[PDB]
Amino acid sequence: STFVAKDGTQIYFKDWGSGKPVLFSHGWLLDADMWEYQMEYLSSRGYRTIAFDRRGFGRSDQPWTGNDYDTFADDIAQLIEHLDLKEVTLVGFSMGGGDVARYIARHGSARVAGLVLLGAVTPLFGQKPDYPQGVPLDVFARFKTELLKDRAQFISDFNAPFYGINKGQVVSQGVQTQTLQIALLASLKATVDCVTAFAETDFRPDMAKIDVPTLVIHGDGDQIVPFETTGKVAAELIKGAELKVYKDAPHGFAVTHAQQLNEDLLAFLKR
Amino acid sequence: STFVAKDGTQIYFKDWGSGKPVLFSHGWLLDADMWEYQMEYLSSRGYRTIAFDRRGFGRSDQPWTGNDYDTFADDIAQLIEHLDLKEVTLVGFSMGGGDVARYIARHGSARVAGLVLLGAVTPLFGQKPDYPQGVPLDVFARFKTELLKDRAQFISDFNAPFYGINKGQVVSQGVQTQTLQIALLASLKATVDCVTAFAETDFRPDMAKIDVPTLVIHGDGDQIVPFETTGKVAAELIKGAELKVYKDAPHGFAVTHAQQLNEDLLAFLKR
């Protein structure tokens, strides 16, 4: 399916099944396909699942402008309005934790029943004056430098630390191939702009506006988004939030810990 | 090109050349690109060739519902009426033999000049009480179990027995790579639903409704769709049907026996 955003950007999405809606927001480099197993799992169990390709990624258009969290959040708002969704459970992975949070902050939670943050960059990823524990911005500067030289090889190299293959996790060549194939669909511009967005956007104000049941899941083996300065803190800043830590799990735990995630999502919805 | 099915599913197709129409229906996991060599061959020789991506596959939309043979047949019906095709020759490979057969069963043969069944699941694939020689359903249950864990690697592993690489056939890395690339485009849900469809659908009633010239081609080295209980039987059940067995050919013989297939299709059309 598609809808057209305010600025004319065509956004691809899937809308599967029937029942209370669960809307998924993918991470950097990937697209809606990253959720295929969670969507099938939940939609065969009484839920309606929706997942979009973020502007500049997957099967969506690749605008030069609007590659920032305020726009990402408004895109989600437009999708929700387009489908006229109510009592929706928002689920975000990695940088996608940011735009579902920013959606709530900018638009409120009248249409929202719950929030799930998976290995998310919330409440803040990069260093700030009062957050020296964050990731130094020159780390992300180097991401950009390498992406602007050879993004294809960057993505390929990213697989190892993403899935924790360098630390004993087992992930098939097939999954690594699919990851690279999907990532290559994306815009070079969007890919680099997203680094700026997730490196420097402060979601701490957002946390204070989240007034729905919230579940935070993170792997404490995460090499990409440090548990200690993200997931751990988000769970504290969001009133009433629940926290689940997957022991030694990597960043890409929707793959390595798929069954566990599926069951945790279902249990959250049934609460 | 695209058309929109009754339920809103956008279906991608290619319509090449001019002359009497030949409409191709692809097998599981693939898309219209599997036919590219037959299409170029025939359209360069005075025929119009049409090939669609089955709902849930390739460049087509990925609906949660309608992943069954009755719907597949009605999609074909819509395409045919869409283009107002007449004296069309239907060509189906593997599970695609099922939906062209079901099209004739459901809609009749007024627009149809002939039928070609290539390594097809017709008249019946999986076991039934009166068909113990069929493939045990637990084989297909296992397919689903593996697909719901890691479909990417399933596809990759499938290449070997599909093309008979494990049994003396030579297929390039390029072909194997393209096969995987195309298969990854598909929906996880459609991929799994199709297993249920081709595993359990009985086309024996369909065979009695086929009242047009028919050519059945099958490799007797087929590791995926057993010749003895499919093609061999279809050729007997369809009145006046012709049977050609490609010696030692694997399931994916459109690749391994391309030239022979091209020439046989042309000969059938010129009968």
Place this chain on the structure above:
Amino acid sequence: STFVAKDGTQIYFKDWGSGKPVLFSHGWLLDADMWEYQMEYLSSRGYRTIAFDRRGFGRSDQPWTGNDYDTFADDIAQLIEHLDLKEVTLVGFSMGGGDVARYIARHGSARVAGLVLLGAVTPLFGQKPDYPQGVPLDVFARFKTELLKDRAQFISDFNAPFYGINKGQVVSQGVQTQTLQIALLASLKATVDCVTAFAETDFRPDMAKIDVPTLVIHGDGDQIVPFETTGKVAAELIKGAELKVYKDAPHGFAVTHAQQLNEDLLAFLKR
């Protein structure tokens, strides 16, 4: 974005940034993505960049007809009119040098501010009676025979001489994988037809109609499109044309010499 050509073919394109427009025409097998780095470079420096997927390639439709330079040129004309572009700088790579040249020859240069020909087939690629120095046509006949057997492996094998990997150039597996992925999106028919097009089309008449500032860049290590009989001659035949030769550079120098190309394009725009 998309527009619809005269014959109904839907063409995909990207339109990034603002300012004086720069329109890119890609080479054989590739698509608009080959320009991603040049587009980001220039659009972050005050220019508007536009790149399309040629009919039959990338994300564009795959027509059976119209796979020839006159049609390619008219496609470009339609895009230029669609966006009402003025003072546009046309940039063509390999076979794409042909359709920007043919656009000017067919439509004039009223809307054109400049022309850049990168490793282009201009003014003539294959042999003619008065051009025995060109590439013998049996070389291209061989391309076609191999493509019509296994285009996937042809593309894979083409990577080496294309990027000069067989002669000391270093190119990542990622780049080679992305190259293959994009090429496989294309139509078999368009792919083969393009060989006929670039093999036999004479652009010498076109050279005389080019009345705008022109920059010709070519690698003198180019194993695909011979500098001595293409770029070298084009620079002489086009009045006022500037010539830059990248020492030992391969055909695919937008990859191997990306930074040098970026800077040369900017310098040309700033003259």
